[PDB]
Design a binder for this molecule. Structure first.
Ligand SMILES: Cc1ncc(COP(=O)(O)O)c(CN)c1O
Ligand SMILES: Cc1ncc(COP(=O)(O)O)c(CN)c1O
Ligand SMILES: O=C(O)CCC(=O)C(=O)O
Ligand SMILES: O=C(O)CCC(=O)C(=O)O
Lengths: 396, 396
């Protein structure tokens, strides 16, 4: 049966890792990683996470199954984190959260729910987006279309081409919005633009799906949800899929959630049971550890405190490196204005380099970036900053 | 879009739980659970698990992502656990394991890989079987067909009708075999019968898919795999989906594996990359905690030692209760021979009770069973043994 199964293409993001590890050159740099990396070059376990993991070690009495929607205050706490604490959505009981294996697992869970319980046939995702988006939606048997977004010339969001491609895009189509720290461009709508997209979204009849994977990495935990919150103000129905893998350093524990808001209570409950049904045939019920650690930190004011500073330090380290990258570049001879690097959010940026410049940097130097020119600013440390910039300058 | 979404039916297994919790009667009993329960009535955390969870608390330096296939020695260790240590399958490098979110996550992962990379259109499952089987295969777009298995008259495996229904069942159809502790009947093929099914399996051209959820709960960790191992002797290709949820008491950490054995190395590698691709669009990579605990136990001869005794105790507790349930029944005045309860394995048995006897038990008494008459023997304690049997005897 398996005789004539063909190989499957290497993942754009994942496969570069092997190439790196395995190239075993000297002062080599990996900017193709999708993970935060501190000044030393490692991805530690947040102190507050470690603290919550001792608390659970001492206090857990059973490892019995969670419900299909997981841990209730994990639920609550992400609802308030997304929609703010006094949200009508929460008071009116219009949203329901299911604990999922990561943000990817929430995307997929949203995908089978829509694919089997609704008339959606198509999901619009930006050009560019995170590659694994086309795949979770195609594996559910949904057509993924692309709207415009980024300007390769001006290094920006060109809103005009974005809104124009989102014309027609028929009523009852799913439009996917990255809520902040757009992977890969790091370019995000302004609060005027989000408001426009919200207004246009109810006029046109689209179903928005926020992919929220980096809350807290742009300008702060509440400011990063203004977007989601402008849309939630004007819609009846909405779907949010978030991941605690970046802001909690909880990557391999698979933590995320798929929130459903519906027009009213009765409906979010009718619709969430069919969401439960999808989970029940996908992985049955969610992994407890990481979401226990996430709910213990967010509910204890001391641990939440520490965590917020840990998030804050991660956010400012990345802001430090965006600044120092355009400066160290300007200094070493950079031929081009790279100041757009500072306008952008979260960990990633399109450096504005050619597929052939990117291979120049891998083959001749140690610099490893994704062939799209995406560089992860988290991998730059004040230590590798000068060699790296010298390599980028040598290929410009 | 969600306005006119319909309710989704209550799960056969899960929905009874609520009915119980919420009935708030006195000395009520719940045998409709699907989790082990010790003498006191609770589902503890195995000591060896807890020991391994401290070890990781101290030693984990990062929570960075796992590969898509998860932890290598988690992989290796389940390969030797399934196929024994000197297996040719292992030595020839014909098997590949991917760490999944539970046994259900391995079933579903098998289902999408087969559905999208193969010619399978159909998976044969026993009558009866675990209800969530029809659904993980149906959610991947596969036809599930049922073969015969159990004799309601004689409380056994009638092999003749099982083999006759598995006739025709076209070449390249997937057949699902429960490796031991057949849920719900507890009836399992003898090693002469497994050898028959193995022989007939290569004559006919079926693709066997073993669901292995309870290894070690029948007669012992290797004896429970002779079956799988007789089929693995004679096949080129085979798929095993196993779960560490019952034998490690690691239910809510989602621990399980999807092993793929192909005719040779190169094909298991070609095929496994498409299995990796299946995962990569489902939940992206697996939850580290529970399978770190299972790799650390199984690799440390001291902790593995303790763990094996803990499994042995759970096994003998269940064997104790099967004996004492038919005894206490004979003594309390049981009108019927229930000796067959002792022939069966692992936590479940069909008590041989009517839907209307099972509702007498719930409505009148505190006894809660699944409407199929499935009772979970782990839910019986020497303490509730007499009131329970008194109720069963009252409805006989
Ligand atoms: C835009 C986007 N959406 C979802 C995810 C998934 O997150 P997770 O690893 O938590 O599944 C990522 C992470 N890579 C992402 O970048
Ligand atoms: C036959 C069978 N297969 C799979 C499973 C599921 O295992 P898990 O809970 O690890 O998904 C069970 C028990 N739930 C089962 O009885
Ligand atoms: O490594 C992973 O599993 C996903 C990370 C990623 O694709 C990214 O952040 O770009
Ligand atoms: O997967 C679960 O949560 C329950 C499994 C079960 O009820 C059973 O095996 O009978």
């Amino acid at each position: 049966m398996f005789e004539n199964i063909t190989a499957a293409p290497a993942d754009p993001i994942l496969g570069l890792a092997d190439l790196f590890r395995a190239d075993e050159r000297p002062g080599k740099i990996n900017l193709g990683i999708g993970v935060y990396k501190d000044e030393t070059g490692k991805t530690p376990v947040l102190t507050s996470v470690k603290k919550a993991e001792q608390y659970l070690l001492e206090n857990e009495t059973t490892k019995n199954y969670l419900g299909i929607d997981g841990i209730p205050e994990f639920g609550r706490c992400t609802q308030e984190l997304l929609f703010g604490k006094g949200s009508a959505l929460i008071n009116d009981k219009r949203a329901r959260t299911a604990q999922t294996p990561g943000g990817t697992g929430a995307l997929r869970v949203a995908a089978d729910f829509l694919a089997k319980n609704t008339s959606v046939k198509r999901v619009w995702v930006s050009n560019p987006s995170w590659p694994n988006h086309k795949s979770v939606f195609n594996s559910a048997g949904l057509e993924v279309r692309e709207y415009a977004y980024y300007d390769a010339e001006n290094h920006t969001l060109d809103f005009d081409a974005l809104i124009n491609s989102l014309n027609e895009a028929q009523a009852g189509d799913v439009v996917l919005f990255h809520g902040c720290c757009h992977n890969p461009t790091g370019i995000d709508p302004t609060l005027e633009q989000w408001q426009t997209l919200a207004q246009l979204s109810v006029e046109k009849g689209w179903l928005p799906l926020f992919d929220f994977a980096y809350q807290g990495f742009a300008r702060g935990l509440e400011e990063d949800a203004e977007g989601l919150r402008a849309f939630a103000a004007m819609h009846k129905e909405l779907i949010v899929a978030s991941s605690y893998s970046h802001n909690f350093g909880l990557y391999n524990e698979r933590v995320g959630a798929c929130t459903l808001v519906a027009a009213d209570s009765e409906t979010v409950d009718r619709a969430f049971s069919q969401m439960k049904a999808a989970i029940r045939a996908n992985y049955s019920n969610p992994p407890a550890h990481g979401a226990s650690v996430v709910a213990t930190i967010l509910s204890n004011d001391a641990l939440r405190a520490i965590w917020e500073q840990e998030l804050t330090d991660m956010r400012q380290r990345i802001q430090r490196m965006r600044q120092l990258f355009v400066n160290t570049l300007q200094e070493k001879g950079a031929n081009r204005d790279f100041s757009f690097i500072i306008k952008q959010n979260g960990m990633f940026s399109f450096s504005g380099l050619t597929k052939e410049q990117v291979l120049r940097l891998r083959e001749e130097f140690g610099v490893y970036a994704v062939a799209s020119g995406r560089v992860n600013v988290a991998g730059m440390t004040p230590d590798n900053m000068a060699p790296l910039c010298e390599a980028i300058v040598a290929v410009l």
